Design a protein around this ligand. Structure first.
Ligand code: Z41
Ligand code: PLM
Lengths: 392, 409, 10, 182, 221, 224
C-alpha cells in the first residue's frame, strides 16, 4: 500500500510466523547488537568515572599550561595578560615553576617550588589547614609545605627549613655550590591526594631561582586532556608551550591505553553481531528462490532489488544502537542510585560515573557501520543472480 | 559404540543448497573468536601472578617496623623475639635513609636502605635479579653502593664512576647544619623491571653506622612471613612481643593493589566473553530453524516408523552440538600456539607501532607474560557447550510438536 | 591498573 | 730548576687593589653569564672579592670562618675552611707551601705556566698561571671535566698595603644568620 | 479374523479455509489374509485412509480398537511401539532418506526398536533377496532408478512381520516386469504366518489380483 | 503485423559444465489477434523458452527487436522498463509471495512501475474480481487451495497487456472446466484494443482450439 517500492517488499518480511518462536528467531540480529552497545556504554562509563576522579585530583592542582619564554624568564611589562588571547584558557595569573630540594633538621627530600600570588585566588586555598593565603609576605620568605612532605621531614608548625635551587644557580669561582635559602613554615595543607607530597607554596616575589620577573603565566584550561591540539596552535612570539606531559605524561597515557584495550575487548560483541546478519541473510536467499526471481520478471532493475536486503541488515543496526544507547544510559546512571547489590567495591565511598554526550554518538555510529559492511556480500548474491538459471 | 542420538546424525549435516558453504565458515569462526581470546586472556593473567611471587614478594620484606625516634637501644633483644614466633621464618634489621643521586644537571629521588649483605640472602632474594656479577666484597672500607636500573638510564652512569648522594644530618639539637655530599662509586646495577628500579638503593650495614655518627644502632626491623596472605594477624603478634605500640605496618597497605585488580579482570572479561559466545550461539539457532524446514519430509518418515517425541527432540540437540564442537575445538587449537608463543607475537606489533605497550614506568612489568594452565582450558569447554545446549533446546522443542498429517507423508 | 589508592595505615 | 720562579717574586707582595672579570663558557662555545667587580687578595689566610653590577655575592674571611652573604635572597651563612674543597686554584696562590709540592711538574714557555697532575683525586685537570715582573698574578683560570672553561682577566694594577679593618663581617640591617660551623 | 474395528470414521480436510468432510461412515474392516482392493481416486479420500489408519491425525468421530486399545484414546507415546512391529507404510512419492545407504534403509525400524544388533545385520540381507536389491547393498538412493527406489519401500514396511501393510500404490513408478514379482513375494508371507495388506489403486486392472473387493465411494470402503 | 523479429536462435545451455546444443533453430513471428500455442515434451526446451524471449536472459546468438531495440545489445538498466509495460508472465508452480495478501499480490506490478497512487484501488481491484476472487480480498496465500492460488497468478498478468503475453501451463494444477472459463474472459480483450497471448502446454486438448495448432519438436517448429 506504500508508494515506495523499496520499503514495501520488506515490511511484511519482518513478522510472518504466527508462533512467538518464529518471530523470536527473526529478531536475533537485533538482540546481539543492543547487548554489545549496552556493554560498551555501561562499562566505559565506569572507566570515565575513574578518569574524572583522577582529573579533579591530579589535574585539578599542579597547573598544566605554563607559557615560558625563550630564555625562561618572562618579563610581565613586555608580555602582559591582555596579549595572550589564546583559546581554551579562562584566567591568566603569574606563576613560577622550578624543581628544588629540601633540607630540614632531620632529613632531606625533593619538591617542586610553586610561587602563587597572595592576592589572587587559588584552588589550594580551601585545602589549607588553618593557613591564610595573605600570610605570604614579601621579604619574610615564608613557605607552605604539604602534609606528606612535612611528615617525612619531621617539620611541625614553627620549624626552619632550607631550600636550594640546583638548576638555576650562580656559578661562583669559590666552589660550584647552588643557591640556598632558609625558609620558615606557617602551616601545612591536606588534599587527600599525591599533590601534597612535593608541592610547596611560596611567594611569587622571590629571587631564589634567578633575578625581577616571572617564568610564565598560569593558564586554567577548560579541557586539560586534549593538550596536543592546544600546543600546535597560533603561538605568539617570544613564548613556548609546556604542558603536563613533562611530569605526568606516562600516567595519563596508561589510562587512555587501558580504555582502548577494554574498548577493543567489548567491541568483539558487535563483530559477532555483524556476523549474525551474514548467517541470517545468507539462508533467506536460499529459501526465497521463487520470490526474488519473480521480482525481476515484473520489470525491476537489479539495483533496486539489492536495497531490499540492504535495509533488512540495516534495520537491526538502527534500532539496535538506539535501544543499546537508551538502556546503556539508564544502567550507568542508576548503578549506585537504586541499590548497591550490583557489586560492592573494597571501600564503597561514592563510586562515580560519567556519561559523556559525545561518547554515546561516536559509539552508536560505529555499530551502524559494521552492520552495513556485513550486508553487501549477501545482497550481491541475490542481485547478481540469473533469472533463467533459477530454480524454475 | 556410538548411540543413535550421535552416530546417525553427522550425515544429516552434509547439505548443499548454494551458498550454504559460506554459512559453515562464518558460524565456525564466529564462535572460535571468543574462545581464542579467552584462552590467551586467562593465561596472560596467570603470568602476572607468576611474576608477582618472585619479582615483588621475594624482593620486598613483609615486616615493616618503624619504632619511636629513640634509635633502638634494645634492637639486639628484639631480633630474637620475632624469630621464635611461628609464621616468621627469618629477620634482619634495616636503616631507612633518604638521598638524592645526582651526577650533574639531573635530580632523582632515591630510597636508600642499610641491610647486612651476609644476612639479607636468608630471608629474601636480592642478588637473584642483578645483571652484573659484582655482588660480592660488600664490606666496610670500600664505600660502595649498588643502584637499580631506573636510575641508570636517567643519571647516564656506568659501573665504576663516582657519584654524589645526600645523607641526613643527625643532630640531637633542633637546628640547621651544612649538608654532606659523600662521594661513592657504583659497584653494579640491578634489574627488577618495575617500579623498584628508580627508587631503590641498598648499602651495607657497616657503612651506614659512620654516616649517622653512631655505634650499634638500627632504625627498623624487617622480617619474612611464610603465609603471605595473613598480613594482618601475624603482624600484630610481633609488634607486642618486642616493645610498645609503635608505627607498625605491613605490605598489605602498599602492595595490596598489585595483588588486586587481576581478580577483577577474572570477573569482568568472563561475563564479557560469554556474551560473545551468546551472540555466536544465535548462529546455531538460525541454522536449526532451516534444518526443520528443508528436512520436513524426513521427520514424517520417523513419525510413521514408530518414533516417540523424545527421540526427535534428541536429534536436533546433538545436531547443533556437532556444529558447535567443530567451532569450539577450533578455537582451542589456535589458542595454545598463541599462549605458548606470546613473546614473539607482542614484540612484533611493537616494532610497527613505535610505542611499546605496558611501559614499566607506571605498570607492573615491561613484557607481557603468559602461563598456560590446563585447568582453565576445561572451564571454557563446559562453558562453550552449556551455552550451545540452551540455544539448541528451543529449536528442538519446535521440531517435535509439528503435525505430520498436514505435510505430505 | 587505573584505580589508584594511597590510603596508608600506621 | 725553574720551580723557584713563583716562589721568589710572590713572597714580597702582600695585597693589591684591582678589578677583575668573570667569563664562563660551556662545551658548545657560548657565554651564559657574566661577572665583574673588584678583589682583595691577602697572603696568609684572608681573601675578599665583591661583584657589583652583574651579580650580588658578599663574602669575607675573619681568620677562622667563611662568611657568605647573598643580597639576592637576603641570607648570610658561615662555614669553616677545611670542610669544603681545597683543590681549587684560588687557594694555592695564597698558601705557597708544601701542599704545592706533591708532583707539580711546572714548565716554562714564556708567560704561560700551565701544569697538570698524573695521579690525583679531584676533578680538576689543568689550570694556567700568569705572573709578571713585579710579583703579581695576572690569570688564574681553570677548566672542569664537565667541558666548562673559564677565564679571569685582571686590570687596574695597584701596589700598596691595606689594614685589616674592612675585612670584618658587617651584615645589613634585617638579614638572617645561619650557623653551619660544626 | 478382524484386525481393526472401524465404526463411523468421518474425517475432514481443510480445502481453502473450508472444513469439508471427505469421509462418511467408514465402518469397513479388513480380513486376516483377505487382500483389500480399495479402489479410491486421488482427491476423494484415498490418501486420508493412509494417515488415519496409522494414527497420524485425530478423526474425532469414533474410536478404532486394534487389540483392546483405541488409537484415539491412547497417547502419542503409546502408539509408537506398534508402528514398527505390526504396522507398515508403503508410499509412492519416494518417502525415504537420501543421506543413508540401502543397507540401513531397510533396517530403519530395526534401529528405532533397539533390538539385538546381531539380528539387524542378518535381517537386512535376507530382505534384499526378496525385493531384488542384491547388487545395490551399499548404495545411495539418489543415484538409483525409479524401479530400484520403489523396492526399498517394500522391505522397509515389512520388518517384524506386520499383520496389515498400508500400501499406497506400489506399482506405477516402475515397469511391468517387477509388478507381479513385488506382489508374489508380498503374497508369499500370506501362506506362511497368515498376514494381510491393504493396497490403494486408482484403476480396476490391479483390483482383480487381490482377493477381496471393497470399493470406496465417499469413504464407505 | 510483425512484433517479434526472431532470427535463428542458437542458445547452447550449459548442462553439466559442457556446452551442448539443445535449443537450436527457433524462429517465429507473432501478432495481434492470433495466438500461437507452442507445445512440446518435458525437457525439449519449451520450459526454458519463456525466459529467452521474455527479456530475462539473452542467448548472444539471436537478437529479437520488439520495440525497435536490440535485446542482446542492451544494458541491464535499459531492460527493466519493458517487462512491466508490454510483457506478461504466467507461471504454474505457484510463484507468489506468502507474506502479502491476495490484493497485494496482484498490485505488485503496479507498485514497481511507480504509477499514480490513487489508481491501484480500482484497476487492481477490478482485475482480481473479474476472475472470481470476490470475497477473498485480504486473504493469505498459505490458506488457499490449489485452484484458488493459480487464479492469483492469472489476474496478476493482465494489468497492462497491449501485446506480447507469455503464459506457461495455466491448467494442470486445477481442472480444465474453469480453466476454459478464464480463457474466454482473457480472449475478450482481443476485440477491444487488440492483443494476443502465448500459451505453452503439453496436451493436445489445450492447443488446437484457440487460434491455430503449433508444435516444437527439438527445433522443428512445423510438421506436427
Ligand atoms: C585493571 C583494569 C581496571 O579497569 C577499570 O578502569 C575498572 C573497570 C570496572 C568496570 C566495572 C563495570 C561494572 C558494571 C558492568 C555492567 C556490565 C553489563 C553487561 C550487560 C548486561 O584496567 C583495564 O581496564 C585493562 C583491562 C585489559 C583487559 C585485557 C584486554 C585484552 C584485549 C584483547 C583484544 C583482542 C582482540 C582480538 C581481535 C581478533
Ligand atoms: C594495575 O593493576 C597495574 C598493574 C598492571 C597489570 C594488570 C594487567 C592489566 C593490563 C594487561 C592486560 C593485557 C592482557 C592481554 C590479554 C589478551
Amino acid at each position: 500500500y506504500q508508494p515506495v517500492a523499496l520499503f514495501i517488499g520488506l515490511r511484511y518480511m519482518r513478522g510472518r510466523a504466527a508462533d512467538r518462536f518464529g518471530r523470536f528467531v527473526s529478531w536475533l540480529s537485533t538482540i546481539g547488537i543492543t547487548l554489545g552497545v549496552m556493554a560498551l556504554v555501561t562499562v566505559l562509563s565506569v572507566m570515565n568515572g575513574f578518569e574524572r576522579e583522577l582529573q579533579n585530583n591530579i589535574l585539578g592542582l599542579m597547573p598544566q599550561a605554563i607559557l615560558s619564554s625563550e630564555h625562561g624568564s618572562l618579563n610581565p611589562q613586555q608580555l602582559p595578560e591582555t596579549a595572550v588571547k589564546l583559546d581554551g584558557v579562562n584566567r591568566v595569573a603569574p606563576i613560577t615553576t622550578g624543581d628544588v630540594v629540601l633540607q630540614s633538621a632531620r632529613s632531606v627530600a625533593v619538591g617542586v617550588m610553586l610561587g602563587i600570588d597572595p592576592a589572587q585566588k587559588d584552588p589550594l586555598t580551601p585545602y589549607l589547614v588553618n593557613v591564610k593565603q595573605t600570610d605570604l609576605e614579601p621579604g619574610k620568605y615564608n613557605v607552605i609545605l604539604g602534609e606528606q612532605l612535612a611528615s617525612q621531614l619531621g617539620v611541625n608548625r614553627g620549624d626552619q627549613i632550607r631550600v636550594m635551587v640546583p638548576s638555576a644557580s650562580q656559578f661562583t669561582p669559590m666552589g660550584r655550590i647552588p643557591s640556598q635559602r632558609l625558609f620558615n613554615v606557617i602551616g601545612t595543607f591536606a588534599a587527600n591526594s599525591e599533590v601534597d607530597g612535593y608541592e610547596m607554596l611560596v611567594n611569587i616575589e622571590d629571587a631564589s631561582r634567578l633575578m625581577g620577573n616571572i617564568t610564565g603565566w598560569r593558564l586554567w584550561l577548560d579541557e586539560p586532556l586534549k593538550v596536543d591540539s592546544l600546543s600546535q596552535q597560533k603561538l605568539p612570539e617570544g613564548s613556548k608551550w609546556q604542558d603536563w606531559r613533562d611530569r605526568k605524561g606516562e600516567l595519563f597515557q596508561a589510562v587512555r591505553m587501558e580504555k582502548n584495550m577494554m574498548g577493543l575487548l567489548l567491541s568483539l560483541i558487535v563483530a559477532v553481531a555483524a556476523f549474525n546478519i551474514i548467517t541470517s541473510l545468507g539462508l533467506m536467499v536460499m529459501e526465497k528462490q521463487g520470490e526474488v526471481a519473480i521480482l525481476q520478471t515484473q520489470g525491476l532493475t537489479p539495483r533496486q532489488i539489492m536495497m531490499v536486503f540492504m535495509v533488512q541488515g540495516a534495520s537491526a543496526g538502527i534500532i539496535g544502537a538506539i535501544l543499546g544507547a537508551a538502556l546503556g544510559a539508564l544502567l550507568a546512571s542508576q548503578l549506585n542510585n537504586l541499590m548497591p547489590i550490583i557489586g560492592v567495591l573494597l571501600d564503597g565511598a561514592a563510586l562515580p560515573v560519567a556519561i559523556e554526550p559525545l561518547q554515546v554518538i561516536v559509539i552508536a555510529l560505529v555499530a551502524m557501520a559494521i552492520a552495513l559492511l556485513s550486508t553487501l556480500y549477501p545482497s550481491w548474491r541475490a542481485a547478481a543472480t540469473q533469472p533463467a538459471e533459477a530454480l524454475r | 559404540p556410538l548411540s543413535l542420538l550421535i552416530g546417525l546424525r553427522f550425515s544429516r549435516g552434509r547439505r548443499r543448497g548454494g551458498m550454504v558453504s559460506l554459512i559453515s565458515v562464518i558460524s565456525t569462526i564466529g564462535i572460535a573468536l571468543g574462545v581464542a581470546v579467552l584462552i590467551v586472556g586467562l593465561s596472560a593473567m596467570n603470568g602476572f601472578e607468576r611474576e608477582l611471587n618472585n619479582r615483588i614478594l621475594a624482593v620486598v620484606p613483609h615486616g615493616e617496623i618503624e619504632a619511636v625516634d629513640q634509635p633502638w637501644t634494645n634492637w639486639q633483644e628484639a631480633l630474637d623475639h620475632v624469630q621464635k614466633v611461628p609464621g616468621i621464618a627469618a629477620a634482619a634489621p634495616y636503616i631507612n635513609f633518604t638521598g638524592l643521586v645526582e651526577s650533574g644537571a639531573n635530580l632523582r629521588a632515591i630510597q636508600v636502605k642499610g641491610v647486612n649483605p651476609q644476612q639479607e640472602q636468608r630471608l629474601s632474594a636480592l642478588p637473584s635479579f642483578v645483571q652484573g656479577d659484582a655482588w660480592r666484597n660488600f664490606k666496610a672500607g670500600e664505600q660502595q653502593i649498588i643502584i637499580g636500573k631506573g636510575v641508570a638510564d636517567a643519571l647516564k652512569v656506568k659501573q665504576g664512576d663516582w657519584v654524589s648522594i645526600m645523607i641526613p644530618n643527625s643532630n640531637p639539637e633542633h637546628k640547621l647544619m651544612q649538608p654532606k655530599r659523600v662521594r661513592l662509586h657504583v659497584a653494579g646495577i640491578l634489574q627488577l623491571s618495575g617500579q623498584l628500579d628508580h627508587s631503590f638503593a641498598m648499602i651495607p650495614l657497616a657503612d651506614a653506622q659512620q654516616y649517622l655518627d653512631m655505634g650499634s644502632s638500627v632504625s627498623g626491623i624487617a622480617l619474612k612471613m611464610t603465609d603471605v596472605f595473613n598480613a594482618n594477624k601475624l603482624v600484630r603478634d610481633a609488634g607486642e612481643v618486642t616493645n610498645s605500640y609503635v608505627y607498625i605496618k605491613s605490605w598489605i597497605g602498599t602492595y595490596g593493589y598489585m595483588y588486586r585488580d587481576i581478580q577483577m579482570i577474572r570477573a569482568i572479561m568472563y561475563l564479557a566473553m560469554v556474551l560473545v559466545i551468546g551472540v555466536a550461539c544465535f548462529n546455531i539457532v538460525s541454522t536449526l530453524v532451516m534444518a526443520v524446514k528443508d528436512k520436513s519430509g524426513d521427520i514424517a518418515v520417523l513419525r510413521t516408523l514408530g518414533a516417540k517425541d523424545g527421540l526427535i527432540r534428541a536429534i536436533f540437540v546433538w545436531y547443533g552440538l556437532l556444529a558447535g564442537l567443530f567451532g569450539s575445538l577450533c578455537g582451542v587449537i589456535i589458542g595454545v600456539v598463541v599462549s605458548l608463543q606470546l613473546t614473539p607475537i607482542i614484540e612484533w606489533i611493537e616494532k610497527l607501532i613505535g610505542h611499546q605497550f605496558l611501559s614499566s614506568d607506571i605498570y607492573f612489568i615491561d613484557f607481557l607474560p603468559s602461563e598456560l594452565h590446563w585447568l582453565d582450558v576445561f572451564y571454557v569447554l563446559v562453558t562453550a557447550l552449556l551455552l550451545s545446549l540452551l540455544a539448541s533446546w528451543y529449536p528442538a522443542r519446535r521440531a517435535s510438536n509439528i503435525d505430520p498429517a498436514r505435510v505430505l507423508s | 591498573c587505573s584505580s589508584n589508592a594511597k590510603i596508608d595505615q600506621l | 730548576d725553574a720551580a723557584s720562579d713563583l716562589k721568589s717574586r710572590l713572597d714580597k707582595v702582600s695585597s693589591f687593589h684591582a678589578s677583575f672579570t668573570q667569563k664562563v663558557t660551556d662545551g658548545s662555545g657560548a657565554a651564559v653569564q657574566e661577572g665583574q667587580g673588584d678583589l682583595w687578595v691577602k697572603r696568609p689566610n684572608l681573601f675578599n672579592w665583591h661583584m657589583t653590577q652583574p651579580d650580588e655575592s658578599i663574602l669575607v674571611s675573619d681568620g677562622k670562618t667563611l662568611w657568605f652573604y647573598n643580597p639576592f635572597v637576603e641570607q648570610a651563612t658561615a662555614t669553616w675552611l677545611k670542610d669544603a674543597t681545597g683543590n681549587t686554584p684560588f687557594m694555592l696562590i695564597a698558601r705557597n707551601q708544601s701542599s704545592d709540592w706533591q708532583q707539580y711538574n711546572i714548565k716554562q714557555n714564556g708567560d704561560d705556566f700551565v701544569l697538570t697532575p698524573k695521579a690525583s683525586n679531584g676533578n680538576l685537570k689543568q689550570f694556567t698561571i700568569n705572573v709578571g715582573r713585579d710579583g703579581t698574578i695576572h690569570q688564574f683560570s681553570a677548566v672542569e671535566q664537565d667541558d666548562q672553561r673559564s677565564s679571569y682577566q685582571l686590570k687596574s694594577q695597584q701596589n700598596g698595603a691595606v689594614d685589616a679593618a674592612k675585612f670584618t663581617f658587617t651584615p645589613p640591617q634585617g638579614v638572617t644568620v645561619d650557623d653551619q660551623r660544626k | 479374523k478382524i484386525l481393526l474395528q472401524c465404526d463411523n470414521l468421518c474425517k475432514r480436510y481443510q480445502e481453502g479455509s473450508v472444513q469439508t468432510d471427505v469421509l462418511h461412515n467408514v465402518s469397513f474392516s479388513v480380513g486376516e489374509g483377505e487382500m483389500m482392493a480399495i479402489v479410491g481416486s486421488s482427491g476423494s479420500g484415498k490418501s486420508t485412509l493412509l494417515h488415519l489408519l496409522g494414527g497420524l491425525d485425530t478423526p474425532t468421530s469414533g474410536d478404532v480398537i486394534f487389540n483392546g486399545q483405541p488409537m484415539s484414546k491412547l497417547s502419542s507415546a503409546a502408539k509408537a511401539e506398534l508402528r514398527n512391529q505390526k504396522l507398515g507404510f508403503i508410499y509412492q512419492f519416494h518417502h525415504l532418506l537420501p543421506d543413508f545407504t540401502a543397507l540401513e534403509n531397510v533396517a530403519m525400524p530395526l534401529l528405532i526398536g533397539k533390538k539385538k544388533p546381531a539380528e539387524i545385520n542378518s535381517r537386512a540381507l535376507e530382505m534384499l533377496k526378496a525385493v531384488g536389491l542384491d547388487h545395490r547393498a551399499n548404495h545411495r538412493p539418489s543415484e538409483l532408478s525409479g524401479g530400484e527406489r520403489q523396492r526399498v519401500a517394500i522391505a522397509r514396511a515389512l520388518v517384524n512381520n506386520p499383520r496389515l501393510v498400508l500400501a499406497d500404490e506400489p506399482t506405477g513408478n516402475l515397469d511391468a516386469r517387477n509388478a507381479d514379482s513385488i506382489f508374489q513375494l508380498l503374497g508369499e508371507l500370506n501362506r506362511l504366518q497368515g498376514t494381510a495388506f491393504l493396497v490403494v489403486t486408482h484403476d480396476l486392472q490391479l483390483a482383480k489380483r487381490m482377493s477381496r473387493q471393497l470399493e470406496m465411494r465417499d469413504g464407505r470402503l
